[PDB]
Ligand binder design. Structure first.
Ligand SMILES: C=CC(C)(C)OC[C@H]1O[C@H](O[C@@H]2C3=C([C@H](C)COC(C)=O)C[C@H](O)[C@]3(C)/C=C3/[C@@H](COC)CC[C@H]3[C@@H](C)[C@H]2O)[C@H](O)[C@@H](OC(C)=O)[C@@H]1O
Ligand SMILES: C=CC(C)(C)OC[C@H]1O[C@H](O[C@@H]2C3=C([C@H](C)COC(C)=O)C[C@H](O)[C@]3(C)/C=C3/[C@@H](COC)CC[C@H]3[C@@H](C)[C@H]2O)[C@H](O)[C@@H](OC(C)=O)[C@@H]1O
Ligand SMILES: [Ca+2]
Ligand SMILES: [Ca+2]
Ligand SMILES: [Cl-]
Ligand SMILES: [Cl-]
Ligand SMILES: [Mg+2]
Ligand SMILES: [Mg+2]
Ligand SMILES: [Mg+2]
Ligand SMILES: [Mg+2]
Lengths: 236, 6, 236, 6
């Protein structure tokens, strides 16, 4: 429950319908129910899971940033006191965002990561674990911020170690992991040099491997490769 | 204008 | 509850923050709490109420249309039987959409419309009543479809009668009401001639009144006037 | 392409 009575295949079917309807919260709940059936997910199913939550949390993070900006301006010299509402509502959004991150991190811990033995699945789930801890780090301000940052780092690092050993440098999961770990270095860990080095090296190694790819692989590696280039252009 | 992630 | 413990002014403040964050479901819940305080709403507050729900229901209607399209294709000759999931999920979205329409219609009935004495507020709320019954009519297929359509018609009609007597032909509420009642005629009531006549007459009477307006009024009347022209162009 | 309402 609430998805326990629905067939696994029906939850998958509805997640795809929710995707087409851009109903990402429904899509995420259907995929959570599918994961809770206890069977490993296929490649396509892992992509549905990650798309659903990426979109839900993406909307919450964008909202949190809007409210945090407002809050920060209300705290500047000469700003009129408007009471607690900005902080209260930023906190409301923050708590819901944290709850989604905790839900995803719990699915990964119970029991996606432990049953994931192939590199494609293991690296994928570890990247998600890195991403959701990174989203927790974006709003963390307390006693726990360092440990949250280290949790993101550790998950990304293990994903990077496996992806380097087991996946070609053009593999889209390897390229996306490196893109996000580079963003983690730049904006969470205060390590813009490391972020730039990682994006550069990633991009360069992928470029040198493109010759091995079919026209279709070439297209999808080059897409993530453009996001690496976008960041390098922004950061340098 | 905002850095990319995926 | 759940907004009963929050100050009216705080709910209004948070609705505006939710608007800026494009968190329309929160915005709608804050404005429902504000309405439930039992005081009339100001012009600006009425606009927040309508924007919040328009966006929430707009997202649900767009999703419902996507799922209805899929459903209709699955019912065509030669389409592979895929089971009940499309119909189930269309029904899920439909029921939630109906619930939002019922929530708005209940706020209007308890007690916005009865306490609204000025034309600007009365016409506004009656237009909303027309709109939310029209959204119910878009998904209605049963015993009740005709009565739902007539409820939308009756609300729009009373709004039109008051707006013609009490508001200039350029007033943006009068122009928006006429735009939506024209859409109601075209696509709900199967009366495209009436829809076109209403849009034409509305547009023409507004054009003849523009000379009375300040530069700022001129701009906002002409905006809705363009949506009337867009429809006339589409329909003729 | 879709009719306008407001
Ligand atoms: C269209 C949506 C669905 C059906 C859910 O698929 C999402 C997408 O799923 C695959 O793409 C994945 C993928 C994305 C691609 C970069 C999108 O590519 C194109 C050309 O649109 C973005 C998605 O969020 C997704 C699933 C996520 C990840 C990311 C997940 O970390 C945990 C690592 C990088 C990237 C990998 C897994 C990509 O392979 C496919 O290879 C894409 O198809 C094509 C032709 O490129 C498809 O659009
Ligand atoms: C920006 C959002 C908020 C703060 C909520 O305001 C919504 C908007 O509120 C007013 O606009 C109303 C209004 C809309 C205007 C057409 C938007 O105009 C511009 C230039 O952006 C669309 C909105 O949904 C809203 C509130 C709704 C209605 C509609 C409601 O039926 C129950 C009837 C037509 C229209 C009327 C009420 C418009 O006056 C204002 O006159 C607009 O401001 C300007 C400069 O035109 C402002 O963007
Ligand atoms: Ca994803
Ligand atoms: Ca509105
Ligand atoms: Cl709040
Ligand atoms: Cl369902
Ligand atoms: Mg089963
Ligand atoms: Mg396994
Ligand atoms: Mg009070
Ligand atoms: Mg009154």
């Amino acid at each position: 429950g609430a998805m326990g009575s629905m067939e696994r295949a029906s939850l998958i079917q509805k997640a795809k319908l929710a995707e087409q309807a851009e109903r990402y919260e429904d899509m995420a709940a259907f995929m959570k129910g599918a994961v809770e059936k206890g069977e490993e997910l296929s490649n396509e199913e892992r992509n549905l899971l990650s798309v659903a939550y990426k979109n839900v949390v993406g909307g919450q993070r964008a909202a949190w940033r809007v409210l945090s900006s407002i809050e920060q301006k209300s705290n500047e010299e000469g700003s009129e006191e408007k009471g607690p509402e900005v902080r209260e509502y930023r906190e409301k959004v923050e708590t819901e965002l944290q709850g989604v991150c905790d839900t995803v991190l719990g699915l990964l811990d119970s029991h996606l990561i432990k049953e994931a033995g192939d590199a494609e699945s293991r690296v994928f789930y570890l990247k998600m674990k890195g991403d959701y801890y990174r989203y927790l780090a974006e709003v963390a301000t307390g006693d726990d911020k360092k440990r949250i940052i280290d949790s993101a780092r550790s998950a990304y690092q293990e994903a990077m170690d496996i992806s380097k050993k087991e996946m070609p440098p053009t593999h889209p999961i390897r390229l996306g992991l490196a893109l996000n770990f580079s963003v983690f270095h730049y904006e969470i860990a205060n390590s813009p040099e490391e972020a730039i080095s990682l994006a550069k090296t990633t991009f360069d190694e992928a470029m040198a491997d493109l010759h091995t790819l079919s026209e279709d692989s070439y297209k999808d590696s080059t897409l993530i490769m453009q996001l690496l280039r976008d960041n390098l252009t922004l950061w340098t | 204008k905002r850095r990319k992630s995926v």
